[PDB]
Design a protein around this ligand. Structure first.
Ligand SMILES: NC(=O)c1ccc[n+]([C@@H]2O[C@H](COP(=O)([O-])OP(=O)(O)OC[C@H]3O[C@@H](n4cnc5c(N)ncnc54)[C@H](OP(=O)(O)O)[C@@H]3O)[C@@H](O)[C@H]2O)c1
Ligand SMILES: NC(=O)c1ccc[n+]([C@@H]2O[C@H](COP(=O)([O-])OP(=O)(O)OC[C@H]3O[C@@H](n4cnc5c(N)ncnc54)[C@H](OP(=O)(O)O)[C@@H]3O)[C@@H](O)[C@H]2O)c1
Lengths: 291, 290
């Protein structure tokens, strides 16, 4: 006998969340501003609620995954009555501020609130590859751990009592994803000028990525210690190599803004006295506010 | 175990030499600054009195200095002694730089391999080291076995084009900076909540590992020119990018990086990619900065 769960929001991610709960035996009530997106889910045994109220009331565990916290707040305020005493899990993407302003709203209405981040794509939801970071009501998490493991069986991980923490890790991890995707796509656009297929490039990209994890492990203690001994490569060397990517790009008639920018960053680090330091020393520039 | 010469004893130079030494090769080393050979000589390398005596000592000359301007200042005064020896240039280079050095070497009948070291010094000699060579097929085939001392698992020959090693290097370095910036800017973010980078890292690396899946899946999309959004649309990426931008501005940390990222999604969407996967960004990355 698997407990009931409600999923509010049936985007690409919403749909995957619901499906995961359904497959894991939970009686799954779904609702979306656009009901058409429940069609395939209802066929597989989900109940499409007539209203968000009837959706919220159906289950003691409400999962919401919509665009942003403006959409969350438009959705949860009209149903604050029916929410009260139910555990609301907000897996929508958010700033720390947004997560914490929603935490304070929920506490005032005695709604136990977990602020979550989905570190996975929809097809990964339900698999060992999915990592979900939750932070907020410790008791509420402890109570529903087993139900929530339907979307992240290997990595249903609770951080701290701070609701804003899930958001901070999410923001930091997404920045790494775009770092990689931009690096690989800009890299494929480079190799493209030599009629090299991205499918050919990829396995090498991924071998390099795997090896770059070593650098991350090794730069971490350097950031924490504030000591940046260059055992691998100096800012000078990084800086010079960055000139090559910038020039290579300009010259091949491809995108040059990304690498030019990267170079602007090394230039600054070196001007702040980091010439002989490892790439870990870039932490100091990344702490400094912009225009 | 054939003799090998390493010209350049920087952090990378020293590691290259050490690898050859440990692998039994009689290793002659030379550097503009001879002090950097000290530890290598103690382990059995011969410090040549001059670059000429260094080049002459072995039929295989490996050079790893700052840039191709430094290579050309070093190799031109010894073009005589080089002739008929295989010169392997593992210095970082543009495709143009690699190819202008290839044409200089051919005129002086010097067999020329242009290489890229896709590894850090401590990862030279291990299975983790990948080295990409491109140029003289015969010269590579002849010295494969000696060169496997620096990259035993991934001593990889590309094509006869000398500039190709440079293109793969440039593309792979772009990914390194992508990740390092992402992780360091990410640690600066988590830092505002007094979270240690050492704590963040294992999660960073779990996410990175999982992002490799996206790369293998976006590759065929870029090559086929079809960007079906099975994971997430440009719209969704675009919105999420707003969050990092705002979060950063607000926490008093660096905001240029994520703001820029967003500028890219905005453009992709304006070029009609709203409903396409992040693979569609290839089209923006092909377009010059104009
Ligand atoms: N791979 C991924 O896609 C991925 C990864 C992890 C995290 N996330 C996060 O998951 C969330 C949803 O992503 P997704 O793929 O489901 O996005 P999506 O496909 O764009 O879906 C957005 C969902 O939110 C609803 N919504 C949007 N604005 C609304 C409003 N003002 N009021 C009420 N409902 C509103 C939409 O309702 P309609 O159907 O009526 O438009 C839809 O159900 C985002 O915060 C995203 O950052 C996504
Ligand atoms: N180390 C890495 O992590 C790594 C990884 C892959 C590729 N690389 C490539 O390796 C090269 C340098 O690596 P590195 O880290 O060992 O560099 P480095 O520590 O900066 O050493 C640079 C080398 O170049 C020599 N040099 C510089 N200018 C010279 C000149 N005008 N005349 C003669 N020699 C000159 C230096 O000799 P002196 O000591 O006399 O100055 C030194 O041996 C770059 O092309 C870089 O892209 C580095």
């Amino acid at each position: 006998d698997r407990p009931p769960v409600t999923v509010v929001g049936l985007g690409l991610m919403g749909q995957a969340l619901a499906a995961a709960f359904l497959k894991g035996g939970h009686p799954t009530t779904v609702w979306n501003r656009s009901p058409e997106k429940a069609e395939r889910l209802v066929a597989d045994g989900a109940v499409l609620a007539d209203t968000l109220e009837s959706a919220v009331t159906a289950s003691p565990l409400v999962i919401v995954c919509v665009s942003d916290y403006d959409a969350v707040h438009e959705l949860i305020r009209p149903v604050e009555s029916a929410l009260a005493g139910r555990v609301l899990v907000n897996l929508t993407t958010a700033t720390s501020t947004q997560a914490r302003e929603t935490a304070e709203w929920a506490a005032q209405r005695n709604i136990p609130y977990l602020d979550g981040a989905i570190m996975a794509i929809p097809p990964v939801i339900g698999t060992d590859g999915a990592v979900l970071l939750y932070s907020g009501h410790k008791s509420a998490f402890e109570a529903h751990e087993s139900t929530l493991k339907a979307i992240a069986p290997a990595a249903t991980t609770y951080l701290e009592e701070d609701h804003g923490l899930s958001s901070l890790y999410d923001m930091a991890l997404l920045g790494i994803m775009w770092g990689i995707l931009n690096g690989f796509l800009h890299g494929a656009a480079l190799l493209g000028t030599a009629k090299v297929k991205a499918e050919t490039f990829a396995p090498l990209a991924n071998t390099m990525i795997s090896a770059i994890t070593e650098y991350v492990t090794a730069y971490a203690p350097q950031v924490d210690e504030g000591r940046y001994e260059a055992t691998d490569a100096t800012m000078t060397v990084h800086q010079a190599a960055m000139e090559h990517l910038a020039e290579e790009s300009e010259h091949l008639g491809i995108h040059s803004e990304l690498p030019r920018f990267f170079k602007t960053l090394a230039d600054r680090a070196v001007a702040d006295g980091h010439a002989e330091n490892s790439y870990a020393a870039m932490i100091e520039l990344f702490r400094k506010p912009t225009a």
